[PDB]
Amino acid sequence: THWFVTQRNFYEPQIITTDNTFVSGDCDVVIGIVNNTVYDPLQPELDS
Amino acid sequence: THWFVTQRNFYEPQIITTDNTFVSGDCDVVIGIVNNTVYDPLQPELDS
Numbered sequence: 001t002h003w004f005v006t007q008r009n010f011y012e013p014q015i016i017t018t019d020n021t022f023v024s025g026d027c028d029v030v031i032g033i034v035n036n037t038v039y040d041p042l043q044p045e046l047d048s
Numbered sequence: 049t050h051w052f053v054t055q056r057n058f059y060e061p062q063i064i065t066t067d068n069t070f071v072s073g074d075c076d077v078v079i080g081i082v083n084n085t086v087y088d089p090l091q092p093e094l095d096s
């Protein structure tokens with residue numbers, strides 16, 4: 001149901017965050033791309 | 049005109065940002081240092 005990022009030698013899922021991913025390009029030129037949400041922890045801090 | 053940071057084996061320029069850099073010392077003990085401006089995306093996030 002959810003998506004996580006983990007290492008390739010031990011199972012240790014983490015929730016997707018901007019600190020864990022690297023952004024580049026557009027959503028057209030990648031085969032097999034899947035859609036989900038990339039979170040941002042700074043928004044609650046800014047709103048508070 | 050502009051200064052970028054890129055990898056060594058494939059030309060892919062990224063905009064100079066405080067996330068890509070690392071701070072140490074002052075501007076007197078490095079030969080060939082160059083004046084420029086290091087941007088910061090935190091200010092628009094915390095202001096706008």
Ligand SMILES: *[C@@H]1O[C@H](CO)[C@@H](O[C@@H]2O[C@H](CO)[C@@H](O)[C@H](O)[C@H]2NC(C)=O)[C@H](O)[C@H]1NC(C)=O
Pocket residue numbers: 027028033034035
């Ligand atoms: C993104 O998720 C959606 C929903 O599953 C997929 O469907 C398309 O999404 C884009 C933008 O998210 C829309 O512009 C299209 O109209 C959607 N097509 C539909 C609903 O048939 C999409 O495949 C996912 N991936 C991308 C890259 O959009």
Ligand SMILES: *[C@@H]1O[C@H](CO)[C@@H](O[C@@H]2O[C@H](CO)[C@@H](O)[C@H](O)[C@H]2NC(C)=O)[C@H](O)[C@H]1NC(C)=O
Pocket residue numbers: 075083
């Ligand atoms: C470019 O960098 C040099 C050295 O970092 C600057 O030279 C110094 O500038 C300060 C004030 O900006 C002065 O107080 C010093 O006397 C200057 N020293 C020398 C040896 O010139 C220079 O001003 C910088 N230029 C710009 C446009 O920022």
Ligand SMILES: *[C@@H]1O[C@H](CO)[C@@H](O)[C@H](O)[C@H]1NC(C)=O
Pocket residue numbers: 079080
């Ligand atoms: C390269 O050599 C020139 C000599 O004309 C000098 O002015 C310049 O500072 C040198 N650049 C570096 C990075 O040392």
